[PDB]
Amino acid sequence: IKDSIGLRIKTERECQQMSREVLCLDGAELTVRQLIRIEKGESLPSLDKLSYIAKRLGKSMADLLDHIEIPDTYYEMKNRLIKFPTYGDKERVKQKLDLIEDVYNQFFDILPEEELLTLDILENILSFTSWEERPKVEEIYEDLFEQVKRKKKFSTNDLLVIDYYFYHLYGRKQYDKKIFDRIVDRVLKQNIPTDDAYNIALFNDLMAIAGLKISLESFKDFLTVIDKLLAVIEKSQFHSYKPGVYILEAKYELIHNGNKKKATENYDKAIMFASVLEDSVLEEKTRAEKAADGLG
Amino acid sequence: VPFFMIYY
């Protein structure tokens, strides 16, 4: 940064066609030796020097220093990572893992530490297989996991690690029920923002919460979970996610209420939606779950 | 883990 600003000062001075001798007739406030050394980039320009050279230039310190930035192309690739449901497909997750490496091999240095954290967590979620073959949520993030259990408001990253905590809990008895029920409470109380990534992250949690609930045959505040889901979709306009909710209402009406008349229609509305979205892998999977639950 | 849990 030393040589960058030193070049910026010189270059701007060249455009103004002003000389070093012109800037300070007295040379008291700025020794000519100092400026020359600064333009060489060998010496860091002290803040008082920056204030002077800008006061003379007739340009504020803010505007030209504000202009490092983050390129828009990264957000395009990030959009490809979170706004494209893979549904655990073989090739759709490999394509994303290849993309994550590409993002790392193209933006690793510029991103804020929170952004690299975001990339790292979901990468573990994508490459996730089962609870037996992969490390616990604590073992990989002890410090972060203990903070989110006591924290009131979660961020986008906190929703991700909690989501990973859900993946490690599926099909797994011998679990701390209280930690689970505390977390699902905090999650439901989270206010829906305008940020897409937060809602998507929150959506993944809510789907995961209901997922574990069905497997463990627990239906406490199940209505509340869906109400959150629908509220998210209404505010985020993620109509592409709405088929997933229909699947949840299906297995609920099938297991809890013991209904098959309304369980079939919920599957039906999901299959139809998966069709109009032209999502092949979605359609064939959700209709396979229909037959798996002893339906047409 | 079921397919409809992975929305990523």
- Compare CB distances from A204 to B2, B3, B8 and report the shortest one's residue: B8
Tally the domains of chain A.
2
Do residues A218 and A146 both lie within one domain? yes
Residue A271 in domain: no
- List, in order, residues 6 or more apart from A192 with CB less than 8 Å away: A199, A202, A231, A232, A235, A236
Which residue, of A217, A238, A259, is where some domain finishes? A238
Residue A222 in domain: yes
Residue A20 in domain: yes
Determine the residue type at A2.
K
Do residues A62 and A166 both lie within one domain? no
Do residues A122 and A29 both lie within one domain? no
Residue A186 to residue A188: CA distance in whole angstroms: 6
Do residues A132 and A225 both lie within one domain? yes
Residue A11 in domain: yes
Do residues A228 and A128 both lie within one domain? yes
Do residues A48 and A117 both lie within one domain? no
Residue B2, classed as helix, strand or coil, is coil
What CATH number should be reported for the domain holding residue A11? 1.10.260.40
Residue A28 in domain: yes
Judge whether A159 is closer than 8 Å to chain B, CB to CB: no
**Residue contact A170–B1, C-beta within 8 A:** yes
Instruction: Give the structural domain span for A163.
Output: 113-238
Residue A49 to residue A38: CA distance in whole angstroms: 10
Residue A21 in domain: yes
Which residue, of A185, A206, A238, is where some domain finishes? A238
Resolution of the model in angstroms: 3.4
**Residue contact B8–A81, C-beta within 8 A:** yes
Do residues A133 and A190 both lie within one domain? yes
Do residues A136 and A220 both lie within one domain? yes
Report how this structure was experimentally obtained.
Answer: X-ray
Do residues A130 and A224 both lie within one domain? yes
Do residues A38 and A135 both lie within one domain? no
- Compare CB distances from B5 to A81, A93, A207 and report the shortest one's residue: A207
Residue A99 in domain: no
Residue A293 in domain: no
Choose the mutation target among A207, A240, A293 for the interface with B, i.e. most B CBs under 10 Å: A207
Do residues A56 and A121 both lie within one domain? no
Which residue, of A47, A66, A85, is where some domain finishes? A66
Residue A213 to residue A166: CA distance in whole angstroms: 11
